[model samples]
Target: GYGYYRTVIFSAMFGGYSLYYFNRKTFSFVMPSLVEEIPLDKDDLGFITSSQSAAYAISKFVSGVLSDQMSARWLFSSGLLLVGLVNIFFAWSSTVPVFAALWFLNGLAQGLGWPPCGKVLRKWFEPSQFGTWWAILSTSMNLAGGLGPILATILAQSYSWRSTLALSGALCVVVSFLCLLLIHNEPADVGLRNLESTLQELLLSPYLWVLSTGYLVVFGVKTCCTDWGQFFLIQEKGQSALVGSSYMSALEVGGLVGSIAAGYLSDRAMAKAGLSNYGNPRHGLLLFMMAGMTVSMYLFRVTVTSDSPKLWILVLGAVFGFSSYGPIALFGVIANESAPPNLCGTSHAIVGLMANVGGFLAGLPFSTIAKHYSWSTAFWVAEVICAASTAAFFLLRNIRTKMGRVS
Candidate 1:
């Protein structure tokens, strides 16, 4: 049956994407060790992440185009293979420049991981089923986030950070070939018909710019917290990286649950207000969750300190992620729904571009703040940004209401 065929396809993509994260996430876990052994500091790490985001932002656009022309399976598999190779280089590198350059290459490879999934999944599922499966596939990153740190922490403690990185690379290199073997580019390979599937002016529209702004800060908050949470624990909380990894794990696991719960709550709330159909705008919801996120982000900053209990840190981290992801998921929905079918990709790219730029800010700028100023000052800057974004979302809802299109 096609059922079994798709199961094979989905499972391969699932595992493949998860391993893609294994490389990306392992860096964060090993940072304390990296700092101790190589003696790199916050600004140095920030520079690496900054360069990495630059490459990642460019490569995402490049890969989006490439996925159109190339074999989805090849792109998917090769991305994993290449990133795995970068991991090995990272394992061996000692200097900040070498490490940053390697991570830049890793960013390009990571971009190749996601774009193909759209090409491959659309080949396997109907339009109605595609969103559901695509959403499920996205959870793989969170799964990897929750587990990768645990695995990386163990390896770093037992062995060295370099060996841990090398092992992750070798593991991905091995599994990527399995993805090549198992992930068919299209249903035609299995003698099945391709499922037929089916955006515009919002590009310069003020409303979309508002939506993009929301996407930017939400993405910034999540990526910033996840990437630097361990260091905050190390420096401010006086906790081991071991405890920080567990806190990160809780955030990831909580984010997974938060996304689903956000969907359910929004659906119910929309239905309750008799706005269940086209008028079910997400900006208001985005604002609510974003407000919650600001509070959570502040709480995460304040509540996780030297005297706080370890369990308290983990729970607050989870709360912070749970609130943050609600808006992250909502922004994508708003961007997608706001456009005509033809312009959907444009809408998404606009929103995502802003998000990537936000990612760039999260790197060097935020880290520099943390380095030069106080962590309190850094978080105060974040809160101010978050507050503005939340207010922008509120304005977006009013504009949408007046325009008579909730999209």
Candidate 2:
């Protein structure tokens, strides 16, 4: 039955990607220990992270295209397996050069994770339900983001960073086989033909361009907050590292809730507005989220103080997470609905590419501003970007409505 297959596919992709996070995030959590153990400088650490980000960004774009033409089941599974192997090898290596190479390989594998899942999602789900389903599936990242660090911290504390990486890699390898066994590439694999879109058509889409821009900003904010939020708390608010980390997890928890809400609200908005399943009601949701995020960013900048209570910071983190992650979760749904059905993977990949580019920039530009000025200055920059994203959402709605000759 359709219900049975849906549950199977959703579970497989969700669980598979959650485990991918286990492999991917283990390194980040273990990095501080690595620095202490290897006695590597911050510059070396930066090089390693930058290399992986660059590789992941490029591979995400290339693999997204390949996912459109190839078998999603194998593409996703093989990518997970490769990442797992690299993680295991990475556990053994201590030198920067070797670590960079292996981490780059792991980044390449990480690119394989999303596009196929996006393809399968659009293929199996109805347009009306896409937002909700995608939102639910997207929570895998937030859930894993919240938990992976804790798990890695525990393992590293209990055993060693090497043991942590090895265990994470082994788990990912096991999940890879499960993905292979469980994921079906498309409805056609089970006897249905899906529409396909050419690269030219996708390239010519103004809607795609606009959405890509929004994705860039939305993801940039999310990554910036996730990567730098703890540092911001530690440096600016004078919080303990443990408390700062807890606040970061609070951000993900908020995101997890916001994603589910965004989907439900968008669906309900469409129904109430008497619009088609693929209509522009989601734009309203996007606008609302972006606006909320802008306010949250400002509040967070203002609220975190040296004397502020930990509860206050955590509360603000939750609000920030909820507002910021809504648009990130919705990006895939918007891309899937906006583009030619056959080109869903490519469309989502294009947005993913842009989002990652934004992520790549977050480390450099934001950090540069923070170093030269204050964390407040850097956060103000993020706040402006958030406001700009809200404006872009408004523009997207206008463009689509004008093109459609609808109000």
Best-matching candidate per lDDT: 2
Residue-wise C-alpha lDDT for candidate 1, range 63-105, written one tens digit per residue: 7556656788898889999998899888998777889899999
In model 1, the clashing pairs are: 199-340, 199-341, 199-342, 199-343, 199-344
Clashing pairs in 2: 195-342, 196-342
**In model 1, which runs have C-alpha deviations exceeding 4 angstroms?**
27-47, 68-71, 88-98, 118-135, 157-163, 184-208, 221-253, 263-288, 294-320, 333-347, 360-407
Query: What's the distance in Å from true for residue 402, model 2?
Result: 13
Tell me the alpha-carbon RMSD of every candidate: 5.9, 3.7
Task: Give per-residue lDDT, candidate 1, residue 59.
Answer: 74
Task: Tell me the whole-model lDDT of each prediction, alpha carbons only.
Answer: 0.73, 0.80
Give the residue spans of candidate 2 off by over 4 A: 32-39, 92-96, 157-164, 192-196, 224-249, 270-279, 300-314, 370-378, 401-407
Question: What TM-score would you give candidate 1 relative to the actual structure?
Answer: 0.68
Worst 10 residues of 1 by lDDT: 195-204
Candidate 2, residues 68-134, lDDT tens digits: the string is 7888899999999998899889999877789989999988888899888887887887666778888
Best by TM-score: 2
